Design a protein around this ligand. Structure first.
Ligand SMILES: [Zn+2]
Ligand SMILES: [Zn+2]
Ligand SMILES: [Zn+2]
Ligand SMILES: [Zn+2]
Ligand SMILES: [Zn+2]
Ligand SMILES: [Zn+2]
Lengths: 446, 446
């Protein structure tokens, strides 16, 4: 099964046939990309808020219009899926989903309300693909650049009525029924500790400072609890690289930031008439991204190394989280940089999957977002910014769906791409919940 | 080769597995959808401005979130393609294309500047896929709901430096070098007459009133010239249905409107805070759409009937034009209705192609647009409107990329779907110019 080695404009884009990305007929190559054999492993890569518009803007800037993302664009089977949520009261669709309801959909196969994690509209728990993978004996990983309490990575290991129930104090207030001191399963962080995935890496060390209100580890901080239960904690790239093994006996918990991990690039926020009233922007690397802080690709690689030792196979979910967050912030450079960062992670995953031969790689997003690529002379009501692209030309990006401080998610269907056994199941129009069933089946989970 | 008979949510969307679109593994079906055999015919359907956002919004409204467009969503091979243009002066990418430069891209395989038709940045003519089909002896058809002088249909039959050169008077002013009285090939309308496609249907009868400034038919109106050259002119559904034959000897020219044909549905325009300050909208059919005015689906059907009599095969381009225009106008109901309209057209095409077995059907758009689907309580800086969907829930649409009267196109990559011989060539990431090469090769054009 071939990965698309190169789909950049083949020549002079101003010349006939120069902007072509194909060099011949793809039928044969697609035929070689189809296989219903079982997938031994599955690597799911989620770009939070990475809709088609976000992929296009990143490519344009970092690779040029005629460019090609070696990871993101390289997957041969592509499709488009829907991700609407449900109204808790009515059960009717809620066209624009949040990060929690969408992550729950692919992780449990059941639609739910905005803000819910691992539960349906009746607030019933439903086992997640990770819990199922672990029950079957497969190794499991959960990697993200956001706090581990954030919706995307949490959905795989927690079941709470509100995504805000990060740790003990919020759970007591927001999720009383989940509150440990009230007989519930616990907060997102407490449930994460219980889920015991083999590899968990991300930020959110802050919440791990809270102390349990009840149970066996009452009075100890969640950090202390983690150590007491046998988790090997690492807090930087050096210690992370030191790790030789990770399993149920000695599970890995990497906390690389108090909150979300640092963004790769820096740039100013989009402003009103910014493309007109101000000069073009050129993003700059964040001096604080650090040599001690592992990158998403580094984390993905270590995770694969450690999880691949499990002979039964593994399930790994990787999240490029700040794409969505910078999109909310109307910061083109942060958004694009996190897209570039995710591409590197996808590349590592594809390299392994290509050698290994029984791995299903899927790259998609939870929901669409605000950013739109518009004409340079656009006079828009929202925030816009002009950027100097690799092409040596200006690209103007617009954020116009909100007068508040955060730009809103949008409900357009978006790209889902895959490579490996069962990749055929992402082609055409599918639903986010279909992704749960595709993975369960590809993995032979029962 | 199977079409996706049904991809609607299989059951209760609130229940586990109820929002699923798939009922099993798609591998085998995808394997049966791949064929490199030659395509005898090609039906290209274009939704002007029909990006993923537009397809989703129309689906949610007309079919419900878990719905399925019998035509648009039924094509099995899907991908995403880029459609950037070029700056005339620099030759550097122009991220947001207009309708002329994009149509030129798939009709000639060469990128060009915004506003250009059938020529590159050096203003050099390049043969279009229609001119090539005809030269090879295949029947040709060009159908649209816009004026025939509009960029999308014109690009198949004309070569002018500016899309504004509709007829004689504008060409003299805007395209002197193309001006007949200055030795050029003539205005868009005159070149259309010259191109002599077998079937041409759309609006734009108004420009045919202009009289030629030079040549064999100087002094005669373009309508007179048409009859004099042997075109059979029809102006309504009745007369259109009367047509039994259409060929080079007796070519068909249907003009069903002075300008653009009437839109299917009516609704109010999106207003500032319209989702908050105003009640939800329910679209209403246009009492003036008329029983005497053939619908896009009718026009496509007649075209297929007439063109299918040619044994060598045919090339037909169908355009659901007013999606783009209503999107520019920020009128959700108009935009959505034209998308529903296009779906009917796609169905007719797929029905024939499925029976015939050697027809490549492609459904795509020239470029993305403004409309975004946002949360109901969104307080946005642009124009918004809340609509009552088939689900019995409210959907809010936002237009926020311009303070002028027209909402701007956007540059996000967008969906391209196909069915039939060589459909594999639209899967994964491709470019709009690749579309030309795919059609030319599938047809065996040399
Ligand atoms: Zn999200
Ligand atoms: Zn996230
Ligand atoms: Zn978000
Ligand atoms: Zn257009
Ligand atoms: Zn058009
Ligand atoms: Zn337009």
């Amino acid at each position: 099964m071939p990965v698309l080695e190169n789909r950049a404009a083949q020549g002079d884009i101003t010349a006939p046939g120069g902007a072509r990305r194909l060099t011949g007929d793809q039928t044969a190559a697609l035929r070689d990309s189809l296989s219903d054999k079982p997938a031994k492993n599955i690597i799911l890569l989620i770009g939070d808020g990475m809709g088609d518009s976000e992929i296009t803007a990143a490519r344009n800037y970092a690779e040029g219009a005629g460019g090609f993302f070696k990871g993101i664009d390289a997957l041969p089977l592509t499709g488009q899926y829907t991700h609407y949520a449900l109204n808790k009261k009515t059960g009717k669709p809620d066209y624009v989903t949040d990060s929690a309801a969408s992550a729950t959909a692919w992780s449990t196969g059941v639609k739910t309300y905005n803000g819910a994690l691992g539960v349906d509209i009746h607030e019933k728990d439903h086992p997640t693909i990770l819990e199922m993978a672990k029950a079957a004996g497969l190794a499991t990983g959960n990697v993200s650049t956001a706090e581990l309490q954030h919706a995307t990575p949490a959905a795989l290991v927690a079941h709470v009525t509100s995504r805000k129930c990060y740790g003990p104090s919020a759970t007591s207030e927001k999720c009383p029924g989940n509150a440990l001191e009230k007989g519930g399963k616990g907060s997102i962080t407490e449930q994460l500790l219980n889920a015991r995935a083999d590899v968990t890496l991300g930020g959110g060390a802050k919440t791990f400072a809270e102390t349990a209100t009840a149970g066996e580890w009452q009075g100890k901080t969640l950090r202390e609890q983690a150590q007491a239960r046998g988790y090997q904690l690492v807090s930087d790239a050096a210690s992370l690289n030191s790790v030789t093994e990770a399993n149920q006996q000695k599970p890995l918990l990497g906390l690389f930031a108090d909150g979300n991990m640092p963004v790769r690039w820096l740039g100013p926020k989009a402003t009103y008439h910014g493309n007109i009233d101000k000069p073009a922007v050129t993003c700059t690397p964040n001096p604080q991204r650090n040599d001690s802080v592992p990158t998403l690709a580094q984390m993905t690689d270590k995770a694969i190394e450690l999880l691949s030792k499990n002979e039964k196979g593994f399930f790994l979910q990787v999240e490029g989280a700040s794409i969505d967050k910078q999109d909310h912030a109307a910061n083109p450079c942060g958004q694009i940089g996190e897209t570039v960062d995710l591409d590197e992670a996808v590349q590592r995953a594809l390299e392994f999957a290509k050698k290994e031969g029984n791995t299903l790689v899927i790259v998609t997003a939870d929901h669409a977002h605000a950013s739109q690529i518009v004409a340079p002379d656009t006079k828009a009501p929202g925030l816009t910014q002009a950027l100097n692209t690799k092409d040596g030309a200006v690209m103007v990006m617009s954020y116009g769906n909100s007068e508040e401080d955060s730009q809103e998610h949008t409900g357009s269907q978006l790209r889902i791409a895959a490579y490996g056994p069962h990749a055929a199941n992402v082609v055409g129009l599918t639903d986010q919940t279909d992704l749960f069933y595709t993975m369960k089946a590809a993995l032979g989970l029962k």
